[PDB]
Ligand binder design. Structure first.
Ligand SMILES: Nc1ncnc2c1ncn2[C@@H]1O[C@H](COP(=O)(O)OP(=O)(O)O)[C@@H](O)[C@H]1O
Ligand SMILES: [Mg+2]
Ligand code: NA
Length: 378
């Protein structure tokens, strides 16, 4: 019975399995190799993953996401108080622990963050079981390197609730290094920089590896910079373009904006491989169809300040680790947003033309390494 490796992401989760000498990343019901970390409650159903994200415009108060920002924290934690103000769902205090309160099957219900995350883990477990054809019970789950003991415990608890035997909780940047075989060095210190630009967060880690032992030397980043911010820059551009062309301001209509945001996230992905993308949304606002386009160059201009800002935490991490650029042996790209060509150019230029490790889809690298580690531990 194969053990699985699970990246339980802030915005997207991913599951892999090591089998027959190789890692397979497992696609879900809709054919997608990553799954949104969303759960929604309706009058009749609990929806998890793609199905939950796909109805967020319809049902915002009862569609939960960002549980990883709450997990293992206390209600009065300044991070929780601050993050709350930008979620459409209600967070309440039950004994200084946060709970999310929703309507389900006509009743008010409340769940701890680890219960919400357990629902995402259940889906990841089910996706794996459908592919393997038998039940899976053992898993490695990853967490950010900066998670404390309470956040690690709560993550393990989420796995227990989902029916998993959690073999180990390992750090995300460590998992990514393992995916590339960087744990095998021989004697001698190797310094690895993991540049992880995901959907909601930006993490830079410098690892030193010595005889297969990992040390985290420095971490930096920004817990509120990621792909979602690039989507919002596109949204704002198109709200303005709609206002010009149709002299109407859609910004007040929450449903129109959410539908526009969905379309922008899709166009953004297209711009990683093409130089132009089309947007076609029927009946966006008061019956008006919005059919337009955007070039890669314009997208890069709209986000240029955000892209450039990713280099300051790199500089900071190097300083805290007391390392020069030349002393970094390997650069590893992690996170879906590192597929953006301008982000790759900025990092490569900053490192004076060095190669980037990017042969493993960056949004899959953490699950990949977790899967390798799971098989070892079994
Ligand atoms: N081809 C692509 N081009 C640009 N951004 C992408 C692409 N594919 C995925 N993304 C972005 O990656 C982000 C999710 O990153 P990921 O690493 O999968 O999640 P997490 O940060 O939750 O671990 C989303 O913002 C998504 O739009
Ligand atoms: Mg991630
Ligand atoms: Na992820």
């Amino acid at each position: 019975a194969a053990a699985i490796g699970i990246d339980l992401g802030t915005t997207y989760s991913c599951v892999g399995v090591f089998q027959h000498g190789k890692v397979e990343i497992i696609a879900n019901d809709q054919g997608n190799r990553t799954t949104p970390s969303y759960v929604a409650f309706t009058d009749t159903e609990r929806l998890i993953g793609d199905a939950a994200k796909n109805q967020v415009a319809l049902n915002p108060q009862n569609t939960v996401f960002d549980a990883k920002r709450l997990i293992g924290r206390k209600f009065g934690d300044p991070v929780v108080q601050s993050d709350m103000k930008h979620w459409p769902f209600q967070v309440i205090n039950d004994g200084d622990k946060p709970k999310v309160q929703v309507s389900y099957k006509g009743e008010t219900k409340a769940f701890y963050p680890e219960e919400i995350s357990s629902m995402v883990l259940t889906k990841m477990k089910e996706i794996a079981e459908a592919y393997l054809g038998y039940p899976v019970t053992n898993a490695v789950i990853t967490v950010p390197a900066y998670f404390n003991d309470s956040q690690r415990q709560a993550t393990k608890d989420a796995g227990v609730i989902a029916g998993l035997n959690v073999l180990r909780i390992i750090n995300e940047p460590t998992a990514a290094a393992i995916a590339y075989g960087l744990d095998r060095t021989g004697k001698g210190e190797r310094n690895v920089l993991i540049f992880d630009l995901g959907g909601g967060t930006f993490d830079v880690s410098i690892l030193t590896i010595d005889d297969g032992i990992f040390e985290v030397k420095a971490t930096a980043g920004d817990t509120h910079l990621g792909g979602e911010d690039f989507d919002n820059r596109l949204v704002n551009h198109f709200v303005e373009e709609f206002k010009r062309k149709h002299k109407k301001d859609i910004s007040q209509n929450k449903r129109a904006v959410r539908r526009l945001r969905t379309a922008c996230e899709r166009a953004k992905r297209t711009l990683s491989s093409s130089t132009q993308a089309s947007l076609e949304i029927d009946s966006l606002f008061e019956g008006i169809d919005f059919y337009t386009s955007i070039t890669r160059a314009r997208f890069e201009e709209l986000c240029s300040d955000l892209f450039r800002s990713t280099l300051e935490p790199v500089e900071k991490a190097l300083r805290d680790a007391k390392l020069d650029k030349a002393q970094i042996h390997d650069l590893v790209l992690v996170g879906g947003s590192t597929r953006i060509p301008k982000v790759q150019k900025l990092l490569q230029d900053f490192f004076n033309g060095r190669d980037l490790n990017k042969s493993i889809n960056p949004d899959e690298a953490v699950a990949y390494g977790a899967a390798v580690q799971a098989a070892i531990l079994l």
